[PDB]
Amino acid sequence: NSIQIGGLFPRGADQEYSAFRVGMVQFSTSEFRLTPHIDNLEVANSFAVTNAFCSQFSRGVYAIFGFYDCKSVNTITSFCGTLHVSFITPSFPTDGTHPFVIQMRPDLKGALLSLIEYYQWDKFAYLYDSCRGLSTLQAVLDSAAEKKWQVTAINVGNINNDKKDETYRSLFQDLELKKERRVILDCERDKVNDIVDQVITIGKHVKGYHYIIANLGFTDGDLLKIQFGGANVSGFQIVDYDDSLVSKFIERWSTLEEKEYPGAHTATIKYTSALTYDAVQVMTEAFRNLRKQRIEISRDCLANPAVPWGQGVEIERALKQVQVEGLSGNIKFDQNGKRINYTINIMELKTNGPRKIGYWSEVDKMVVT
Amino acid sequence: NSIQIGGLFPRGADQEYSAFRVGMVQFSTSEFRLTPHIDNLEVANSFAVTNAFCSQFSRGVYAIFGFYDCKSVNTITSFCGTLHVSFITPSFPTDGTHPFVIQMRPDLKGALLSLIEYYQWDKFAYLYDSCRGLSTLQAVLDSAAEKKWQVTAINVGNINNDKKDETYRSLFQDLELKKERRVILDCERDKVNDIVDQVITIGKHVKGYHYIIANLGFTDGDLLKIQFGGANVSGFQIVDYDDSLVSKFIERWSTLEEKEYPGAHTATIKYTSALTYDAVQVMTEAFRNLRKQRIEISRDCLANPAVPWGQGVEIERALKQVQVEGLSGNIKFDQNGKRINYTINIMELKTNGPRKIGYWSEVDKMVVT
Ligand SMILES: *[C@@H]1O[C@H](CO)[C@@H](O)[C@H](O)[C@H]1NC(C)=O
Ligand SMILES: *[C@@H]1O[C@H](CO)[C@@H](O)[C@H](O)[C@H]1NC(C)=O
Numbered sequence: 090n091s092i093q094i095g096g097l098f099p100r101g102a103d104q105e106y107s108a109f110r111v112g113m114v115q116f117s118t119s120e121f122r123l124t125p126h127i128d129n130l131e132v133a134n135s136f137a138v139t140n141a142f143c144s145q146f147s148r149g150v151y152a153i154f155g156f157y158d159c160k161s162v163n164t165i166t167s168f169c170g171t172l173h174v175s176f177i178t179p180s181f182p183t184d185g186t187h188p189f190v191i192q193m194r195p196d197l198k199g200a201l202l203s204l205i206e207y208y209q210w211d212k213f214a215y216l217y218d219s220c221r222g223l224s225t226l227q228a229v230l231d232s233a234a235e236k237k238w239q240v241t242a243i244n245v246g247n248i249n250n251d252k253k254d255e256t257y258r259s260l261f262q263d264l265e266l267k268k269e270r271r272v273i274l275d276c277e278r279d280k281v282n283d284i285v286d287q288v289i290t291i292g293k294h295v296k297g298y299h300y301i302i303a304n305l306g307f308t309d310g311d312l313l314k315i316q317f318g319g320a321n322v323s324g325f326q327i328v329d330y331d332d333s334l335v336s337k338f339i340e341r342w343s344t345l346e347e348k349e350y351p352g353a354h355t356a357t358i359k360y361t362s363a364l365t366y367d368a369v370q371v372m373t374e375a376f377r378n379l380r381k382q383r384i385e386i387s388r389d390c391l392a393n394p395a396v397p398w399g400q401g402v403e404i405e406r407a408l409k410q411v412q413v414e415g416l417s418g419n420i421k422f423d424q425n426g427k428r429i430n431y432t433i434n435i436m437e438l439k440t441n442g443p444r445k446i447g448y449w450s451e452v453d454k455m456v457v458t
Numbered sequence: 459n460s461i462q463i464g465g466l467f468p469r470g471a472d473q474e475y476s477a478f479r480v481g482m483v484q485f486s487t488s489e490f491r492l493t494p495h496i497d498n499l500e501v502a503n504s505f506a507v508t509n510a511f512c513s514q515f516s517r518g519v520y521a522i523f524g525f526y527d528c529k530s531v532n533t534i535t536s537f538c539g540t541l542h543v544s545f546i547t548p549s550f551p552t553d554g555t556h557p558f559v560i561q562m563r564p565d566l567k568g569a570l571l572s573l574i575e576y577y578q579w580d581k582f583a584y585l586y587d588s589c590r591g592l593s594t595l596q597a598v599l600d601s602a603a604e605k606k607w608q609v610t611a612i613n614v615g616n617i618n619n620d621k622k623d624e625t626y627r628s629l630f631q632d633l634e635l636k637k638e639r640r641v642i643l644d645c646e647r648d649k650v651n652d653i654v655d656q657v658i659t660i661g662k663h664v665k666g667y668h669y670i671i672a673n674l675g676f677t678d679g680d681l682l683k684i685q686f687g688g689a690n691v692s693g694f695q696i697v698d699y700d701d702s703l704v705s706k707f708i709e710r711w712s713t714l715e716e717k718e719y720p721g722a723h724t725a726t727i728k729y730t731s732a733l734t735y736d737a738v739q740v741m742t743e744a745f746r747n748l749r750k751q752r753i754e755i756s757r758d759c760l761a762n763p764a765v766p767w768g769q770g771v772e773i774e775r776a777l778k779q780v781q782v783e784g785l786s787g788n789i790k791f792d793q794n795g796k797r798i799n800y801t802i803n804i805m806e807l808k809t810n811g812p813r814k815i816g817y818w819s820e821v822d823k824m825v826v827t
């Protein structure tokens with residue numbers, strides 16, 4: 090008895106797909122196997138996403154694993170909720186409550202505000218790039234009001250075509266309007282590189298900067314290849330390499346072959362990819378526990394009725410009731426498919442590389458060394 | 459020769475639909491008539507919007523008139539651009555460039571920043587409610603950085619269920635953490651009422667507040683029915699009642715019958731509704747000028763190919779090339795379907811009612827009396 094699922098992958102998310110195939114192997118059994126059907130697509134494109142989702146709906150699928158972007162998230166949330174098909178995703182978690190959405194990624198906002206407190210910052214910059222940026226920004230601004238922080242929040246993303254000395258050094262005239270040194274960067278890695286390169290070209294106070302990078306993959310590959318010119322650099326990490334699961338997993342990961350398993354074979358793995366492998370565990374567990382109650386039951390998105398609410402909700406609740414350890418640590422979901430009981434490691438870039446200075450917990454706030 | 463169009467109306471946008479039927483009459487001729495097919499729907503619902511749009515696409519339509527919301531705007535922009543069907547809309551204009559979208563509504567951000575300057579504000583609050591709020595907020599924050607304004611930006615919308623003294627008076631503890639009196643309100647009218655009512659209950663400095671209401675209908679009906687307790691209250695207005703078109707139009711508007719023309723019969727008209735009537739002019743003009751070059755040509759959104767790009771783009775350009783005077787004044791569109799050469803009247807609430815203290819122009823910044 091194989092269970093059919095969707096896979097919505099962004100074009101060129103090779104590592105993530107590789108992690109998926111791996112997880113597929115690792116948590117398959119005699120008892121059953123998940124059979125995925127994969128679309129690769131421009132996830133920013135809402136028409137593209139609608140169309141792939143419908144295609145999957147009409148094959149009949151028990152769940153969809155997949156990704157969204159700022160532009161497409163409402164398409165997913167709406168089609169999920171309308172059609173009672175569960176979507177599991179490493180993508181950014183939505184502010185709101187949204188049924189039929191299992192959110193593999195934990196929420197950084199908590200940690201980010203705690204970190205801001207810990208470093209005793211009260212006058213700083215926030216450079217945002219996209220809805221992910223905004224949504225965290227908002228939480229910050231709401232607290233800025235409450236703790237009287239002085240935030241200079243700027244939208245680095247909203248630059249037409251290239252961003253130059255003309256824009257970025259224009260930006261550092263605005264930032265050197267208050268001698269601003271503490272900086273939060275919530276942008277794609279290229280922007281981080283491009284912004285930081287500008288601090289360097291300008292050539293004043295380069296080592297004096299303290300950057301916080303607001304994502305969960307500090308020690309994924311490409312970030313720490315940026316020349317930060319010796320500034321203090323902090324960040325976050327959900328895949329802890331001192332864990333047994335992870336080190337075990339990484340032994341296998343680094344010895345696979347790129348030709349067969351593209352983006353594999355590295356010391357580390359992108360959180361999106363780890364969350365993907367974790368997702369596969371979460372899915373198989375919930376179908377396992379669905380079989381423990383002896384349930385199955387059975388398998389055009391615009392004309393034909395939705396999956397009956399009662400059938401759909403039992404799959405949703407199975408997914409949300411799962412509790413496991415995987416690469417992202419303790420996987421557990423609240424009523425809304427948001428992760429709970431998770432911890433996020435706080436990281437600083439020291440001479441000898443990136444070092445955990447502490448963790449943050451959902452149950453508890455920042456804890457040291 | 460009748461031309462077929464879509465009408466996507468939000469459920470309970472009666473005035474707007476009434477304005478549409480009126481405009482339909484007013485700018486119909488022997489030469490041709492537009493035949494609209496109407497869906498009424500939850501425009502916040504992306505699945506609802508997709509489905510109505512597809513339904514229209516598959517009837518074959520030369521254009522769609524309609525509305526979107528924060529949640530649905532990307533569905534419209536994506537399906538428009540994918541399918542080469544022009545969408546005309548009084549809804550909030552998008553930051554970006556988006557093909558096949560004709561944006562009837564002018565952009566307030568310009569005026570809002572100019573107004574903020576004129577009043578020589580440099581420490582103030584911004585209470586936002588939704589993407590419309592955010593997108594303007596962003597423009598403000600970007601300039602705040604540049605002019606060293608001290609903005610306390612708070613998300614009044616993101617309150618679970620009811621907002622109380624517990625939230626709103628919690629909010630006025632955060633706002634009386636800097637004796638904040640200058641306030642920008644970018645929220646639905648109920649929030650405006652609810653926020654202002656709280657200033658009143660608190661009962662300190664009530665007349666000392668200065669509110670700016672960030673929308674284009676100051677002198678639409680319901681806003682000025684709020685008890686502002688004698689504070690300075692400013693705002694914006696695109697329908698100028700001293701114009702001839704408008705006064706002529708209003709003579710007719712107030713003498714129609716509610717039973718036949720619901721939300722009609724009032725002294726004033728909501729900008730969304732005026733922009734609707736203006737839209738109808740814009741559409742008929744562009745089909746008129748399409749007939750001047752002797753063009754027609756001819757009439758499942760997920761399987762079947764799009765409207766051929768070359769057919770579609772000639773309708774788009776016709777719409778964008780239109781220039782007319784209607785209720786919103788000088789209607790003219792740039793390359794991206796954004797309004798240009800528009801003016802926005804600046805308004806203050808005085809004892810003797812709302813009075814134009816000045817206008818702002820796209821060509822020029824704030825001008826007095
Ligand atoms: C950067 O890190 C060093 C190392 O502890 C610290 O002494 C310094 O104060 C930090 N810079 C700022 C601006 O806090
Ligand atoms: C939290 O996670 C730890 C290990 O990560 C686990 O032992 C514990 O049961 C979890 N707590 C809850 C409330 O599930």
Ligand SMILES: *[C@@H]1O[C@H](CO)[C@@H](O)[C@H](O)[C@H]1NC(C)=O
Pocket residue numbers: 639666667668690
């Ligand atoms: C409110 O308007 C009055 C009328 O001109 C003005 O004198 C006063 O300064 C305004 N209040 C503020 C806080 O600017």
Ligand SMILES: *[C@@H]1O[C@H](CO)[C@@H](O)[C@H](O)[C@H]1NC(C)=O
Pocket residue numbers: 787788790799
């Ligand atoms: C601007 O609008 C005025 C009247 O509203 C009109 O006379 C003028 O032609 C317009 N300017 C441009 C550049 O179209």
